[PDB]
Amino acid sequence: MEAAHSKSTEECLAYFGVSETTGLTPDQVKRHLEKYGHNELPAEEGKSLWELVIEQFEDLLVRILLLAACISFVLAWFETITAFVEPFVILLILIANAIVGVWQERNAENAIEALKEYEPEMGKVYRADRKSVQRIKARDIVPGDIVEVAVGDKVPADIRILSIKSTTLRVDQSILTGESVSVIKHTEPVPDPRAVNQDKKNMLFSGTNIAAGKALGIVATTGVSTEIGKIRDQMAATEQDKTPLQQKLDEFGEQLSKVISLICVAVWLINIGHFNDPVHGGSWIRGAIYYFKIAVALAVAAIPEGLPAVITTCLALGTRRMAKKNAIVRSLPSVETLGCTSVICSDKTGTLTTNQMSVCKMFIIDKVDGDFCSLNEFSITGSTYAPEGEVLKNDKPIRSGQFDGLVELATICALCNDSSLDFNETKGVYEKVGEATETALTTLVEKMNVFNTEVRNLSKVERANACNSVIRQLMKKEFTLEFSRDRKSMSVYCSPAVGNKMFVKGAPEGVIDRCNYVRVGTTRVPMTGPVKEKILSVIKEWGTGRDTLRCLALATRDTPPKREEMVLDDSSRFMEYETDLTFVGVVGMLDPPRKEVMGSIQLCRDAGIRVIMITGDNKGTAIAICRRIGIFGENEEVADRAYTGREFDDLPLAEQREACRRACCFARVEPSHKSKIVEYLQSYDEITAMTGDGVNDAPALKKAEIGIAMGSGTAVAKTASEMVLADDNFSTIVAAVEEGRAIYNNMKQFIRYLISSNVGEVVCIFLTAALGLPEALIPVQLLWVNLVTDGLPATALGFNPPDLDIMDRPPRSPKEPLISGWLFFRYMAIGGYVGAATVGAAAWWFMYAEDGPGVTYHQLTHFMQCTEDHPHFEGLDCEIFEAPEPMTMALSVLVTIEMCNALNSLSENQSLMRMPPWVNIWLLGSICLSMSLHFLILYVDPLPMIFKLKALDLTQWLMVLKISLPVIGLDEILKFIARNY
Numbered sequence: 001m002e003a004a005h006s007k008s009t010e011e012c013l014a015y016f017g018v019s020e021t022t023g024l025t026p027d028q029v030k031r032h033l034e035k036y037g038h039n040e041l042p043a044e045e046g047k048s049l050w051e052l053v054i055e056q057f058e059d060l061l062v063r064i065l066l067l068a069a070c071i072s073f074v075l076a077w078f079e080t081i082t083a084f085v086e087p088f089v090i091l092l093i094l095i096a097n098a099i100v101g102v103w104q105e106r107n108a109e110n111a112i113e114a115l116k117e118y119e120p121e122m123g124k125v126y127r128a129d130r131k132s133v134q135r136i137k138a139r140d141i142v143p144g145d146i147v148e149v150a151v152g153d154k155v156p157a158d159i160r161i162l163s164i165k166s167t168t169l170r171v172d173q174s175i176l177t178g179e180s181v182s183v184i185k186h187t188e189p190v191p192d193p194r195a196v197n198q199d200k201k202n203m204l205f206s207g208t209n210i211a212a213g214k215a216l217g218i219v220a221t222t223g224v225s226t227e228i229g230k231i232r233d234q235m236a237a238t239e240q241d242k243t244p245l246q247q248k249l250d251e252f253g254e255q256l257s258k259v260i261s262l263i264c265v266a267v268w269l270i271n272i273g274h275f276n277d278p279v280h281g282g283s284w285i286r287g288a289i290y291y292f293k294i295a296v297a298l299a300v301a302a303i304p305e306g307l308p309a310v311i312t313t314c315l316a317l318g319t320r321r322m323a324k325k326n327a328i329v330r331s332l333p334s335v336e337t338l339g340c341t342s343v344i345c346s347d348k349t350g351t352l353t354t355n356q357m358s359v360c361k362m363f364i365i366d367k368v369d370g371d372f373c374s375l376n377e378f379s380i381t382g383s384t385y386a387p388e389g390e391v392l393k394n395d396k397p398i399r400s401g402q403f404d405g406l407v408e409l410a411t412i413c414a415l416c417n418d419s420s421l422d423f424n425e426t427k428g429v430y431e432k433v434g435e436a437t438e439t440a441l442t443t444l445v446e447k448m449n450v451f452n453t454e455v456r457n458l459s460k461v462e463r464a465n466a467c468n469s470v471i472r473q474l475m476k477k478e479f480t481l482e483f484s485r486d487r488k489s490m491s492v493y494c495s496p497a498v499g500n501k502m503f504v505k506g507a508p509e510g511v512i513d514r515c516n517y518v519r520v521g522t523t524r525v526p527m528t529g530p531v532k533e534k535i536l537s538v539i540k541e542w543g544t545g546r547d548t549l550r551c552l553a554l555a556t557r558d559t560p561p562k563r564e565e566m567v568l569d570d571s572s573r574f575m576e577y578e579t580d581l582t583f584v585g586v587v588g589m590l591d592p593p594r595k596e597v598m599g600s601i602q603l604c605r606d607a608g609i610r611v612i613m614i615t616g617d618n619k620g621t622a623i624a625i626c627r628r629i630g631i632f633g634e635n636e637e638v639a640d641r642a643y644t645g646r647e648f649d650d651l652p653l654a655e656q657r658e659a660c661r662r663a664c665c666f667a668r669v670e671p672s673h674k675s676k677i678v679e680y681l682q683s684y685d686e687i688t689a690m691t692g693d694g695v696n697d698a699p700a701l702k703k704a705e706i707g708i709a710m711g712s713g714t715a716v717a718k719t720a721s722e723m724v725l726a727d728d729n730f731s732t733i734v735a736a737v738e739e740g741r742a743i744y745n746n747m748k749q750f751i752r753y754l755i756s757s758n759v760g761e762v763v764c765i766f767l768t769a770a771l772g773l774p775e776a777l778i779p780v781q782l783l784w785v786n787l788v789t790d791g792l793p794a795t796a797l798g799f800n801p802p803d804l805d806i807m808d809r810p811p812r813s814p815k816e817p818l819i820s821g822w823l824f825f826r827y828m829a830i831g832g833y834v835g836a837a838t839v840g841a842a843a844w845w846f847m848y849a850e851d852g853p854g855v856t857y858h859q860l861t862h863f864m865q866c867t868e869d870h871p872h873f874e875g876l877d878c879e880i881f882e883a884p885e886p887m888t889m890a891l892s893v894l895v896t897i898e899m900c901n902a903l904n905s906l907s908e909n910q911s912l913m914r915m916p917p918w919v920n921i922w923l924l925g926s927i928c929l930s931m932s933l934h935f936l937i938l939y940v941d942p943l944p945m946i947f948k949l950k951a952l953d954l955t956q957w958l959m960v961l962k963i964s965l966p967v968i969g970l971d972e973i974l975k976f977i978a979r980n981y
């Protein structure tokens with residue numbers, strides 16, 4: 001029964017056909033169970049390890065390395081036990097990467113699983129099989145059950161309240177709305193069928209807790225049909241798109257397999273002459289192994305094997321750096337999307353403001369005489385909940401007792417108040433107890449002291465509620481008509497210790513319209529036009545002007561209805577009970593913006609980031625707060641840039657989308673508006689950050705690219721967000737966006753660095769196959785360079801100093817390629833250089849070397865025919881074509897070039913003369929370690945046998961530097977072109 005809130009208690013019992021005193025019969029239970037199912041959210045279908053390792057080996061680059069490992073294993077089988085090192089190392093990389101992925105998924109938290117924590121194990125129902133209550137498992141509760149809840153119990157299903165067995169019934173509906181005060185519940189129907197959950201005063205929602213009381217109710221919905229179950233369906237339907245960099249890895253792997261297959265076809269096309277080669281020969285099995293070994297090396301030379309270790313290391317370090325700035329990022333890929341933020345939608349109370357209220361102004365009526373009117377405006381000092389402060393008028397200290405209107409003003413503030421003040425000696429600060437807006441009144445009456453009580457020598461703990469207690473002794477608060485949004489006010493019925501009176505407080509428009517008289521000191525005058533105009537005039541200046549105050553109208557019913565003539569169970573009659581009032585005065589309190597917020601808004605407009613405020617204030621004050629903190633200008637038109645919840649719904653779907661393109665302020669929004677705003681922003685391809693802190697906010701937090709939770713927010717809101725603000729501050733968002741931009745600038749530098757090395761490595765392997773030369777580089781050597789030799793300077797590039805204008809540039813387009821245009825041409829020339837400089841270093845040892853044979857170019861290209869000891873090949877040991885020294889010339893050239901290419905990667909276009917290499921101290925130290933590790937595999941005896949290397953001399957190294965160092969001069973000329981042409 002979805003509309004149970006709008007149905008009578010008799011209508012709900014008649015729908016299910018269940019007696020309130022007997023309950024559901026054993027037949028009705030098993031028959032309702034087969035129709036509505038069990039009262040539980042669906043279990044989240046987790047994936048197995050087998051499904052997780054299949055997803056790990058689903059990536060195309062992973063499948064290429066796995067195939068290359070399989071080829072290497074069968075090549076090592078058909079050949080020295082160091083041969084199986086190449087298959088084993090390749091497998092260890094994939095296996096280790098899988099373990100990392102398995103650990104990440106296990107550590108990951110699911111918000112749908114978190115919703116279960118709001119499911120009680122047990123419930124209490126009355127059924128026809130027993131007279132007494134039955135404590136059954138909440139899973140077995142069906143719609144139509146008669147349920148009994150009490151203090152401490154968690155509500156097991158969406159329950160329509162039938163009768164309240166206690167005096168009142170207060171519920172903690174905080175799981176839906178962050179952290180909130182207890183709400184009073186009744187049993188009368190709510191006329192609006194499209195009413196929101198705040199207005200369903202006759203409903204108990206599954207997952208909430210009973211703060212006080214005891215009631216009997218009938219179950220309306222269970223399972224996914226509850227309010228907390230409908231939110232689970234919205235989250236289960238939301239799909240998280242891949243981050244732009246995750247998508248770029250897909251296109252890179254898809255294009256890489258197309259190039260590898262093309263290089264293989266090119267190698268075969270160049271060697272088609274072997275089809276005319278004589279059929280009889282023993283080099284055919286050799287030729288297959290030759291092309292199979294090249295295929296293995298071609299894959300290892302193309303895949304950046306060390307990139308996943310460098311990326312996750314950069315993100316893990318940035319997470320620790322953001323946590324120092326109170327930004328808790330929960331997912332590592334979210335750091336990239338963090339820097340791409342285009343729109344920030346932020347709640348006000350708590351984040352944009354300090355949520356610490358204090359009354360700043362107040363006015364009472366001074367004189368009413370026809371068209372002449374006079375007011376007594378006041379000012380209060382002290383922005384904290386502490387009673388320290390004084391009341392001023394015209395910047396002059398005054399005594400509140402000398403004004404009679406202020407005596408009645410303070411009594412309304414002290415009696416029509418459910419909150420209190422407490423002093424904490426551990427923190428040494430007065431603390432609030434209840435609503436922040438109500439506690440501002442308790443602090444105000446302590447500063448006024450209308451009865452001139454003596455509190456100078458009182459203890460600080462006693463000083464907190466001293467003046468409040470004095471007023472409470474005078475009038476006995478009988479009952480309380482709680483706040484409701486239909487009338488936007490509350491009242492209390494009081495008797496002396498003089499007749500009974502009612503003290504009313506609430507929104508100014510509703511209370512003043514229900515006032516027929518006006519208090520003037522101790523006397524009262526009928527409410528007239530000129531007085532009502534000037535009263536509302538000051539409300540507009542305090543709420544819309546530069547004060548940006550929240551105003552409360554305080555009134556009194558001098559002649560309240562008799563106690564017997566009032567029904568304290570129908571919230572519909574509460575407005576009638578609060579009529580024919582007498583205006584007493586208006587207080588104006590401020591929720592101050594945080595110190596750092598006004599500057600963070602300027603950083604956002606300097607960085608092209610739009611800020612959208614989300615409040616619960618009226619449209620007039622919301623626009624005023626925007627002008628105060630910097631979202632709008634002081635004199636800027638905002639007719640089509642600010643909307644309310646009702647204004648936004650009355651628009652067609654096309655106008656709603658166009659509204660979100662320019663709006664910067666949304667006041668009094670419905671729960672579904674956060675998710676709709678995200679969709680409209682995504683329709684313009686924005687990258688949206690949204691704040692929230694309740695289960696209500698969870699669907700929008702998951703929908704947005706960067707859901708933002710509060711450190712004090714609910715657990716479900718955190719598990720549905722990418723980043724959690726430890727201090728709830730809005731400035732933490734902007735600081736994390738700056739860091740995400742700084743991380744990406746360094747990230748794309750060591751991505752271009754490692755990828756350009758893989759280009760030159762593939763050119764090296766291609767030149768070997770296309771010319772028929774011996775293998776100048778071995779997959780075992782290429783793995784060491786990509787994982788260790790180039791991995792250390794790549795990590796050091798992640799510590800590059802960020803640009804000082806990084807927050808002075810618009811947000812980066814998500815589809816911006818990492819390498820394109822002239823940079824695509826540069827890494828082709830660097831790749832064409834590395835490929836030629838590596839195979840040439842080995843050919844130098846095989847020909848023009850003093851310590852190597854003077855093998856001719858024909859013999860080196862036809863080295864697979866030395867086995868015959870052909871007279872065509874001058875007499876020589878054929879094993880020389882398998883010598884370790886020529887591979888050390890090629891490897892030491894690649895290592896030294898990559899150390900040089902790492903310096904060229906410090907800046908995209910700025911010359912090394914302008915930006916010297918000693919800017920990044922970590923990069924110089926990484927090159928020394930990578931070079932120190934190069935001599936480790938050349939001299940410490942176990943390693944040269946494995947890597948097929950033999951140490952070089954002081955002369956052979958000088959030949960490496962002859963070919964390697966001009967890399968710096970080449971890229972410098974390519975940088976000079978981009979800068980000046």
Ligand SMILES: C/C=C(/C)C(=O)O[C@H]1C(C)=C2[C@H]([C@@H]1OC(=O)CCCCCCC)[C@@](C)(OC(C)=O)C[C@H](OC(=O)CCCc1ccc(/N=N/c3ccccc3)cc1)[C@@]1(O)[C@H]2OC(=O)[C@@]1(C)O
Binds near residue numbers: 763
């Ligand atoms: C890999 C090795 C080789 C040899 C190769 O064939 O490479 C080609 C190739 C696949 C390219 C092309 C390359 O073509 C050429 O060399 C043309 C032939 C030249 C030789 C001719 C001889 C006659 C490029 C190399 O050519 C040059 C010069 O740079 C540029 C560009 O690469 C990138 O931008 C790198 C993204 C890495 C990249 C990959 C992943 C990634 N992941 N983030 C994460 C973030 C967070 C978490 C996880 C992950 C981010 C980035 C591409 O064009 C690329 O394919 C594409 O689609 C582009 C747009 O990526």
Ligand code: NA
Binds near residue numbers: 702707
């Ligand atoms: Na999200």
